[PDB]
Design a protein around this nucleic acid. Structure first.
Ligand SMILES: Nc1ncnc2c1ncn2[C@@H]1O[C@H](COP(=O)(O)OP(=O)(O)OP(=O)(O)O)[C@@H](O)[C@H]1O
Ligand SMILES: [Zn+2]
Length: 1935
RNA sequence: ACGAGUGUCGUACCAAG
RNA sequence: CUUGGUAGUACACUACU
């Protein structure tokens, strides 16, 4: 209500205004006090401000536009010389900043492991291996510094011949659970653990070894890195790599048998045999053995390192009987920052057979071979996790790099993979992070690679492999610019509505970066971007990274303090803003934006709950961290500084609770509270920490106060809705819809570039081709306009740091949706935010207070007054991520200014330009297409980049040097690529993130996260086989982490009534069984769906086996629970009582909400950090209330009386407090507030493998470590199985399960129908990859609103909830209530409640509360399982309907080499007048295009009286359109049927009141101006007709009633003003002659034209006077013949029959002599919705052709070049001998065919379009030629003999194959073969012996003849026959 | 030795003799 | 240097849903 008068007192505002010109200060002042409600209009102030700055904006825009003439065309090209200069400068800077060491022995270990081949001779028994190690260590020959101590270690570990009592002692120690019991000169304490015997080791030797070799108790320069550019160092690195290649690439001499193979080999092989072969090769080599041995050894070292001593060491072993590791004494691994010290020892027979990655200490000659000992290695928990998880990462990297590349050798790939996966140091991060940007910029057309390399790039090479990688990067950067010219665009196949073919040609020419070989462009980009994602997180030590981040922030703030004086500049000064240009841009942008939508303020108040309560906003009541400023002494640093500000970090909701309890916040609506807080809170404090990402330099992250949180939330929500950003998307996790937005933009520029050049060069290329039947050609070719495409992928440098915060002041002051008081208070907040202070973390203060020796130039000391305080003022740096949307809006305004610059600049050259630019937080992608003829392209590019940099500097921004590059066909938005219209993404980045990043929450949590990552990768276009690889690796890693491998601790095979992990649900620690399509589309629920589908297939009669899923489910009533296998009963009980019911709680639920129950049953307990909880103010209140006489039961009663507090976490202050206190009882919500370190969660599963962790309590109440449950995994399985055996299974429960897992959600029904009814078709190659969502996804969504809102409405029983539409909640709640009533949930809940109460005698609040909690949780999960977040997919084609989407998706996920066509037997998808219109616009045009004229009417009548469309009968739709008054749109239909009336013709003539625009024929392509132009525009007493061909309008016939030139011109002007749609500008000019009238066109606006009719004298006279004085002149186009017709011309029904005696069309009839009645076309992708009885004509089936989508093209070339699989789809002869009968009914009209025309642009590409064919180009002729080719192709392909196809010897093989196909059940590739055979025998005239087949039963014969038959090479039959053979052999093996 | 680093660190801690 | 005793998180973590 009242404003903030304190705003005009602020020192920040005082500085802001004095920095501005006096008139600008005034205009700002009147801008602040402007009220949009109290003035005449809402734009008076904005219009005034825009007009004030109009002159200066025009001056700047013109000055920047005229700079295209001052360009020179010499931009930044990163060729070899520039790269070399940058490399030299970088070397100089690095040698300055580092201490370069040229010694080879100063290398750090590249891999902290030395390996040797396992000995086939020695045994694998632990004691024998220990004896061997001892004896070999004792016999060391030679002398060194530690040889004596090593031999003493050998002495003190021998046991002699006392092994039996040794193993007895060890076994007894293990059985009982410390005293050293000496065996033989060895004080054994445990298995493989020994006590240091001072009698066997010298004192000096022991002390020296323990202090120097291991550094145990032994306790300024520059970092010492190796010489990366030295010749000797690079040669040594090459020798190391070559030695590793030589030794590790030898075969293991084993048999690969592991979990991954035995579980997923069939799937991976049936998706790609190559991938299976690659895995089989990898598993046989020494690389996999080495990595597995190292991982197992590391696991053993971590396991045994718990209870050590100060003189004890351990001998950890592994599966390799030649590799041992000594675990030297250290701290307990499960402690804080605990390290482990070890030393690898290898015993090998012969020297140089040792893996030395720079870690070997020395190899010595012992008895019977050599012994090799590595150096001591000290590692922490995090790097140990990476070491353990390395095998999966290595396998994934190998299969990503080798996938589909015959020109890359596996050994080199595996060398790189092993040296990159086991590297746990920053040395490789410092190269992987910059290499991406460096190589991408280097390949670019224009970029700053030289500058980036020279003054930013800094390799950090402490290892030899780092030197190798640096050399590889140098070579790749040298070669990128000289190989950029090897990419070529693909031939574009566009059809004026879609681009069928687009992208980069698959030319494998580009040289591989890391490998010897050649790669394609996509593979090259993968190799560039893939190495970024191997890097580990949390490698930064806080001790150094914290001071690094502090140095960065403090240095930037010091620079801003002492170097930036002026804020507003006009010469693009860095970190300055052009004031007037900014003001004008804000005016224009706000005025444009506030015009599209009207209720903008209403949307702000509604979508952000500004009028609601504080407790209803998720961002204010979450579990995140906040900041508290105050005194926390109770909860050396304090008594050091008198200005030290105390602080603590708490949770968001806890701070909200504290604020509510202390009356700081009230129950007023949130916006009022925030508005008061804008003036109440005047000091803002922020604290920073390290994010811990994988980049070489970490990023600072700032935590703020809750008051700052509310106040910034207000501003961000005000500015967010003005942006064009989707409000359901994440800034942190950008949605995949951008990948489609990029594609749409690329298509738009592609169409613009294709059309504009053609339009401007038609006459030039015509003059050229006329001379082709010489220098004139060169002159014409130089005189034409050429095309250009540019895309500037840029990122802004210091988006949050180096920005002018003063521009947001103007942005707020110009916002008209805000009252003067609101602007006052928001500006007061902005001023106070400019005065925020950064509090240094106390860890940093401790680090800096232990210095003593002072830093030479300590900036922190200088601006903390020698650490007098810990607070630093930060003025111009708005903190990272606090102002995303406002900065995005300002960036969009800047880009609008840049677009204006480019548009004016190009109009200065009389060209055409089209610019689109996407603006995210700071990432940029601007696409520019320019067509002109004035200057060269290089000058255009130079000017574009110069003005781009200037525009960014204009608004205080600054583009990065590292991330800004320009390209001709590579668009790069946020982690997404668009390769010339074809979308592209690096799918491997998700697989690597799934393999590396693991939260270790539990088995299902990790498995679900990894499967979700695999699903996302599939959605990003991952090949199916590699997705199976990732899924298998996820399974194997999850099973290895929790000891689930067969024979381990928690293996559940022997505890469940199953036989394999396959038959066990993943919810109970099984493996997932589902085709990849279900995984991609649903995720984590595909197992249940697949099990139900398998149940249906197993237990459905054969009569309904091929029907829909609903039809087979209808038979579930006939099912019996008795005749079910125990496994199926087990899984059905699981589904009934754990998915659809809450019979067993995974954990104690008392205190839980409805949304905190997962899909898991056995959730292991996690860390409950007691220390973290004591920091919470509300936790003390919870403790006090718990320790009360009757406090808790009263709270339980209050919750029971208001059950809505379970779903809704609180909606008011009192209710929110009670709900928080209640939730503190969850025993799992306390885990979410605790510290869950992935390191200790990792070590938990290895250290404590038998500790009970699972908190399982059965069916509905039937000193210790921090992590402790009640039962172990084995006990959990046993108890759960016992409990499940106590329930009963009835057929009604099965019906309920099938009704509420499949039948409820339409998406589940659709997926089941696709899985059951799928028919696989012709193989095709991926050439037109395109993004697409699933169309009409509103109709397949069962619950429209969010599950949380639905449950809130259900709890309140109110459909009209605060934030949702009541109309949809009506249906949502009725669905939820129907679910509740049908499953018998509420009444059963009351049954147990009453039964328990009666048993106990009195009411028990706890049991009822638990029951209600289970009820709400089950309802919430049911609603949640309905929504399937199907985001955009990357499909081989474009999808128009749901069935098309499903078919494309299923065909894209069955093979890696090619994608197939999928057809469905029935309708998988199982305003009414609109359906009728679509029904007839299809069938009419279908008959005209594809049906002969003779049979057209008969086919139409058959469809009308027998077919049905979209489950509606066609007859009903025709009756509907008859009743409607829009029948005049279907005049040809009514005439052909006979239902036309004279009233219809009167109405048709009555459509002359508004000029009746009728297109007598459809243009072949109207945008490219192709097709016979036959147009008629008529009004009352006037009509015209236009005829032309593509470019030239032949003649126009005009009929009028009064032949006077004035009336002629007026009538022509009226007619041309109609919505004819014809451009009249693309048409070429025509010669003008006296005495004739010519069609003329004018340009008036920039893109608006006016067409009139004039005379030769008039046009000449006006041209000759206008040419004298841009230049808009009268251009004639077509001559007109004026005629006089006074007649009524009343169209009568009697005339139509006579007129149409020769036209048999169904979509066009001669309503007059020169005018036609037409039916609007409809796309044939929807043609599948029809369903009816088959139409058998001869041998073909029209109804199947109605379904065969691949044959619905109207292009002659596509049909003639098809495959015979389409005919196998069509054919249903049932006893025919000739094919000519069927071909008669097909059409014989001319059909379109393809032509190519080169496009003149810097990316050279050729487009292929459609054009009208000649007389012989008909559908029937294409059919005949296709048959004549493909029948012979198949016959030779399947000859299986020499005599011929018809020879009986071949007929025997055909009989065998058809018998195999028929006896064995039908497969996914069996019908096509047998129908192809039928077609070919029809062709050979031996159809009598196709229905005469029989059997030739032993499967040995079947196996033999299938295996031995040859496979064809040239025909497309190769792949399909291979698939058929593989499937049939697999199935007969299953037999 | 190893991790980190052009920021002084980790490189287990305490008590007894 | 010998003996005894002690040790569960990096107490860690944002804005954007
Ligand atoms: N994890 C995050 N936390 C907070 N804000 C983030 C985060 N990730 C992205 N952002 C937002 O997006 C921007 C991305 O900036 P980016 O990481 O490119 O660095 P920058 O500040 O632009 O500096 P430079 O380009 O020199 O690295 C941030 O400034 C912030 O607005
Ligand atoms: Zn037949």
């Amino acid at each position: 209500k009242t404003g903030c008068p304190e705003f005009w007192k602020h020192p920040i505002y005082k500085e802001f205004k004095m920095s501005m010109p006096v008139p600008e200060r005034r205009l700002f002042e009147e801008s602040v006090k402007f009220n949009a409600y109290e003035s005449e209009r809402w734009n008076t102030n904005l219009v005034k401000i825009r007009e004030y700055t109009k002159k200066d904006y025009s001056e700047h825009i013109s000055k920047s536009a005229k700079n295209i003439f001052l360009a020179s065309g010499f931009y930044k090209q990163p060729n070899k010389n520039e790269i070399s200069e940058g490399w030299t400068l970088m070397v100089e800077r690095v040698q300055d900043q580092r201490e370069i060491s040229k010694s080879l022995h100063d290398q750090k270990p590249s891999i902290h492991f030395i390996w040797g081949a396992h000995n086939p001779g020695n045994s694998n028994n632990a004691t024998f291996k220990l004896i061997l190690l001892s004896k070999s260590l004792q016999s060391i020959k030679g002398i060194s510094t530690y040889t004596e101590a090593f031999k003493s270690l050998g002495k003190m570990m021998d046991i002699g011949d006392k092994a039996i009592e040794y193993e007895e002692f060890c076994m007894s120690l293990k059985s009982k659970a410390l005293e050293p019991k000496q065996i033989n000169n060895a004080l054994v304490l445990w298995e493989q653990q020994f006590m240091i015997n001072n009698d066997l080791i010298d004192k000096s030797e022991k002390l020296k070894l323990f202090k120097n070799f291991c550094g145990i108790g032994k306790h300024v320069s520059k970092p010492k890195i190796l010489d990366f550019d030295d010749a000797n160092m690079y040669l040594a690195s090459l020798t190391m790599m070559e030695q590793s290649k030589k030794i590790l690439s030898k075969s293991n001499g084993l048999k690969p048998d592991n979990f991954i193979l035995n579980e997923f080999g069939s799937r991976i092989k049936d998706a790609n045999k190559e991938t299976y072969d690659n895995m089989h090769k990898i598993f046989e080599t020494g690389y996999w053995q080495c990595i597995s041995d190292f991982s197992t050894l590391m696991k053993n070292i971590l396991s045994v390192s718990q209870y050590n001593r100060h003189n004890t060491f351990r001998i950890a072993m592994c599966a390799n009987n030649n590799v041992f590791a000594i675990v030297f004494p250290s701290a307990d691994i499960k402690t804080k920052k605990a390290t482990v010290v070890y030393s690898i020892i290898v015993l090998h027979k012969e020297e140089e057979n040792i893996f030395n990655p720079g870690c070997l200490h020395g190899t010595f000659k012992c008895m019977n071979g050599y012994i090799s000992i590595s150096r001591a290695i000290r590692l922490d928990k995090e790097r140990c996790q990476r070491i353990v998880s390395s095998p999966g990462l290595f396998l994934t990297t190998c299969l990503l790099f080798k996938h589909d590349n015959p020109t890359l050798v596996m050994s080199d790939i595996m060398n790189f993979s092993i040296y990159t996966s086991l590297s746990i140091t920053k040395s490789v991060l410092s190269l992987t992070e910059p290499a991406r940007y460096m190589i991408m910029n280097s390949l670019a057309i224009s970029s700053n690679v030289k500058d980036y390399i020279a003054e930013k790039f800094s390799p950090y090479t402490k290892t030899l492999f780092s030197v190798y990688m640096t050399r590889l990067i140098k070579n790749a950067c040298f070669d990128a610019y000289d190989q950029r010219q090897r990419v070529q665009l693909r031939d574009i196949y566009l059809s004026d509505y879609d681009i069928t073919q687009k992208g980069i040609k698959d030319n494998r020419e580009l040289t591989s970066i890391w490998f010897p070989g050649s790669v394609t462009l996509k593979e090259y980009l993968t190799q560039i971007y893939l190495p970024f994602y191997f890097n580990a997180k949390g490698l930064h030590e806080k001790h150094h990274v914290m001071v690094d981040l502090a140095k960065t922030i403090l240095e930037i703030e010091c620079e801003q303090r002492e170097n930036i004086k002026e804020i507003w500049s006009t010469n693009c000064t860095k970190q300055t803003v052009n004031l007037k240009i900014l003001i004008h841009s804000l005016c224009k942008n706000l005025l444009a934006d506030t015009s599209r939508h009207n209720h903008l303020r209403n949307r702000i108040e509604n979508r952000n709950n500004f009028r609601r309560s504080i407790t209803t906003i998720s961002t204010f009541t979450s579990s995140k961290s906040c900041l508290k400023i105050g005194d926390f002494r109770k909860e050396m640093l304090r008594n050091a500084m008198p200005n030290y500000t105390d602080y603590i970090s708490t949770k968001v909701f806890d701070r909200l609770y504290e604020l509510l309890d202390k009356k700081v916040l009230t129950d007023k609506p949130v916006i009022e509270q925030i508005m008061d807080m804008m003036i109440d809170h005047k000091k803002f404090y922020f604290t920073f920490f390290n994010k811990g990402q994988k980049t070489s330099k970490d990023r600072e992250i700032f935590v703020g106060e809750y008051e700052a949180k509310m106040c910034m939330y207000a501003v961000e929500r005000i500015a967010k809705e003005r942006c064009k950003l989707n409000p359901d998307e994440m800034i942190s996790e950008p949605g995949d819809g951008k990948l489609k937005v990029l594609e749409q933009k690329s298509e738009q520029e592609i169409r613009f570039l294709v059309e504009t050049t053609r339009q401007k060069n038609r006459e030039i290329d015509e003059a050229i081709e006329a001379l082709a039947t010489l220098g004139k050609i060169e002159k014409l070719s130089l005189g034409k306009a050429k095309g250009l495409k540019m895309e500037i992928n840029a990122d802004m440098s210091k988006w949050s740091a180096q920005d002018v915060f003063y521009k947001y002041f103007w942005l707020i002051a110009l916002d008209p949706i805000l009252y003067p008081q609101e602007k006052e208070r928001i500006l007061y907040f902005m001023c106070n935010y400019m005065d925020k202070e950064l509090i240094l973390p106390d860890e940093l203060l401790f680090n800096l207070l232990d210095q003593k020796v002072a830093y030479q130039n300590d900036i922190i000391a200088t601006m903390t007054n020698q650490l007098n305080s810990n607070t630093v003022l930060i003025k111009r740096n708005w903190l990272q991520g606090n102002f995303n949307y406002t900065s995005s809006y300002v960036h969009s305004c800047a880009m609008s200014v840049y677009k204006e610059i480019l548009k004016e600049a190009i109009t200065l050259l009389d060209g055409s330009i089209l610019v689109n630019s996407l603006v995210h937080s700071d990432d940029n992608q601007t696409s520019i297409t320019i067509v002109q003829d004035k200057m060269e392209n290089d000058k255009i590019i130079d000017f574009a980049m110069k003005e781009f940099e200037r525009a960014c500097l204009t608004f205080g921004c600054q583009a990065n040097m590292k991330k800004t590059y320009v390209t001709n066909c590579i668009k790069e938005f946020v982690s997404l690529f668009n390769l010339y219209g074809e979308p592209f993404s690096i799918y491997g980045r998700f697989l690597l993130t799934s393999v590396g990043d693991c939260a270790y929450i539990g088995p299902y949590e990790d498995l679900a996260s990894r499967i979700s990552s695999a699903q996302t990768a599939i959605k990003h276009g991952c090949p199916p086989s590699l997705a199976w690889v990732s899924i298998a690796i996820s399974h194997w890693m999850t099973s290895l982490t929790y000891n689930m491998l067969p024979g381990q601790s928690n293996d559940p095979i022997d505890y469940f009534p199953a036989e394999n992990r396959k038959d066990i649900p993943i919810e109970l620690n099984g493996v997932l069984d589902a085709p990849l399509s279900m995984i991609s589309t649903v995720g984590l629920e595909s197992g249940n769906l697949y099990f139900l589908i398998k149940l249906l297939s197993k237990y459905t009669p054969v009569m309904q086996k091929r029907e829909s899923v609903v039809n087979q489910i209808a038979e579930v009533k006939n099912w019996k629970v008795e005749d079910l296998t125990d496994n199926e009963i087990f899984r059905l009980k699981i589904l009934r009582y754990l998915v659809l019911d809450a019979e067993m709680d995974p954990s104690d639920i008392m205190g839980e909400t409805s949304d905190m129950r997962g899909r898991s049953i056995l959730t292991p307990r996690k860390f409950t950090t007691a220390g973290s909880l004591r920091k919470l103010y509300s936790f003390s209140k919870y403790q006090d209330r718990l320790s009360s006489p009757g406090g808790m039961v009263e709270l339980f009663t209050y919750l029971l009386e208001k059950p809505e507090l379970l779903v809704t976490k609180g909606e008011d202050m009192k209710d929110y407090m009670e709900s928080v206190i209640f939730r503190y009882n969850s025993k799992r919500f306390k885990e979410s507030l605790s510290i869950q370190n992935p390191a200790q969660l990792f070590i938990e599963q290895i250290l404590f493998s038998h500790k009970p962790v699972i908190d399982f309590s059965g069916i509905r109440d039937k000193k210790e470590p921090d992590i402790l449950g009640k039962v172990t995994f084995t006990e959990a399985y046993r108890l759960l199985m016992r409990d499940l055996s106590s329930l009963e299974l009835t057929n009604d429960d099965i019906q309920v399960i099938y009704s509420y897992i499949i039948l409820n959600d339409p998406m589940m029904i659709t997926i089941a129908n696709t899985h059951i009814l799928s028919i696989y078709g012709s193989p095709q190659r991926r050439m037109g990859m395109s993004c697409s969502t699933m169309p009409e996804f509103r109709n397949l969504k069962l619950i429209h609103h969010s599950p949380a809102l639905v449950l809130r409405a259900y709890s309140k029983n109110n459909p009209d909830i605060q934030g949702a539409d009541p109309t949809e909640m009506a249906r949502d709640l009725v669905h939820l209530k129907e679910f509740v009533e049908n499953t018998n949930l509420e009444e059963k809940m009351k049954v147990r409640i009453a039964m328990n109460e009666a048993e106990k005698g009195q009411r028990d609040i706890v049991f009822e509360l638990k029951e209600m909690t289970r009820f709400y949780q089950v309802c919430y999960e049911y609603v949640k399982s309905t929504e399937h977040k199907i985001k955009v997919f990357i499909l081989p084609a474009k999808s128009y309907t749901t069935t098309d989407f499903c078919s494309l998706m299923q065909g894209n996920l069955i093979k890696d080499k090619e994608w197939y066509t999928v057809h469905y037997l029935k309708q998988i998808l199982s305003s009414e007048q609109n359906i009728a219109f679509e029904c007839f616009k299809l069938i009419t045009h279908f008959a005209d295009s594809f049906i002969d004229s003779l049979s057209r009417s008969a086919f139409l009548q058959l469809i009308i009286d027998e077919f049905s469309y979209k489950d509606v009968k066609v007859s009903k739709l025709y009756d509907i359109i008859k009743n409607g008054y829009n029948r005049t749109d279907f005049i040809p239909l009514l005439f052909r049927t006979g239902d036309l009336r004279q009233a219809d013709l009167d109405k048709y003539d009555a459509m002359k009141s508004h000029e009746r625009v009728t297109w007598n024929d459809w243009q072949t392509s109207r945008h490219l101006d192709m097709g016979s132009i036959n147009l008629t525009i008529t009004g009352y007493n006037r009509s015209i007709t236009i005829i032309g061909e593509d470019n030239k309008l032949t003649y126009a016939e005009l009929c009028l009633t009064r032949k006077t030139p004035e009336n002629i011109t007026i009538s022509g002007r009226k007619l041309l003003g109609s919505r004819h749609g014809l451009k009249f500008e693309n048409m070429s000019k025509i010669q003008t002659y006296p005495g004739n009238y010519y069609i003329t066109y004018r340009k008036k606006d920039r893109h608006q034209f006016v067409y009139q009719i004039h005379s030769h004298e008039s046009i000449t006279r006006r041209n000759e006077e206008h040419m004298a004085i841009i230049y808009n002149e009268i251009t004639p186009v077509c001559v007109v013949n004026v005629a006089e017709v006074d007649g009524d011309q009343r169209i009568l029904i009697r005339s139509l029959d006579y007129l149409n005696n020769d036209i048999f069309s169904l979509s066009r009839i001669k309503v007059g002599l020169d005018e036609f009645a037409t039916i609007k076309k409809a796309h044939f992708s929807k043609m599948v919705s029809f369903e009816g009885p088959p139409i058998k004509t001869g041998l073909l089936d029209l109804t199947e052709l109605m379904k065969s989508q691949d044959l619905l093209n109207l292009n002659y070339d596509n049909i003639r070049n098809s495959n015979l699989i389409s005919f196998s789809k069509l054919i249903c002869c049932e006893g025919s001998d000739n094919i000519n009968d069927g071909l008669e009914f097909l059409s014989d009209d001319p059909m379109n065919f393809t032509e190519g025309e080169a496009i003149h642009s810097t990316p050279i590409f050729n487009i292929y379009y459609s054009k009208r064919g000649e007389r012989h180009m008909t559908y029937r002729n294409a059919i005949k030629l296709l048959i004549e080719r493909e029948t012979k192709i198949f016959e030779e392909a399947f000859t299986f003999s020499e005599n011929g196809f018809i020879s009986p010897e071949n007929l025997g093989c055909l009989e065998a194959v058809v018998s195999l196909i028929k006896l064995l059940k039908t497969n996914e590739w069996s019908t096509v073969i047998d129908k192809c055979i039928h077609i070919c025998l029809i062709k050979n005239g031996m159809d009598h012996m196709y229905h005469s087949f029989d059997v030739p039963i032993n499967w040995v014969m079947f196996r033999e003849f299938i295996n031995s038959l040859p496979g064809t090479d040239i025909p497309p039959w190769n792949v399909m026959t291979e698939n058929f053979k593989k499937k049939c052999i697999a199935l007969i093996n299953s037999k």
